């Protein structure tokens, strides 16, 4: 039931408060882990916690906060983990 969600998201994501609100909804969830800016303009995220706590959390990253236009997320799930203790962003 524990589980790690590997997500990149695209779009217009990148100046828009997306990390905040990710790390915002993460900590709400009790989710571990990070949201990351990569050098193509796309945000990386990596999360662990229970499979329905990721699951909501995806949902939030499909919508994004209001100046973000999301373009369908690539997404993952593998196993869980333990490296992280909070969530982090970058």
Same mark, same amino acid.
């Given at each position: 039931? +524990?589980?790690?969600?590997?997500?990149? %998201?695209?779009?217009? %994501?990148?100046?828009?408060?997306?990390?905040? /609100? %990710?790390?915002?909804? @993460?900590?709400? +969830?009790?989710?571990?882990?990070? @949201?990351?800016? +990569? *050098? =193509?303009?796309?945000?990386?995220?990596? @999360?662990?916690?229970?499979?329905?706590?990721?699951?909501?959390?995806?949902?939030?990253?499909?919508?994004? *906060? *209001?100046? @973000?236009?999301? &373009?369908? *997320? =690539?997404?993952?799930?593998? &196993?869980?983990?333990? &490296? /992280?203790? =909070?969530? &982090?962003?970058?």
């Amino acid at each position: 039931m +524990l589980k790690r969600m590997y997500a990149r %998201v695209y779009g217009l %994501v990148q100046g828009v408060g997306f990390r905040k /609100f %990710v790390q915002i909804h @993460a900590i709400r +969830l009790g989710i571990k882990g990070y @949201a990351k800016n +990569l *050098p =193509d303009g796309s945000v990386e995220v990596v @999360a662990e916690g229970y499979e329905e706590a990721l699951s909501k959390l995806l949902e939030r990253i499909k919508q994004g *906060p *209001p100046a @973000a236009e999301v &373009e369908k *997320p =690539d997404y993952s799930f593998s &196993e869980y983990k333990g &490296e /992280f203790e =909070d969530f &982090e962003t970058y």
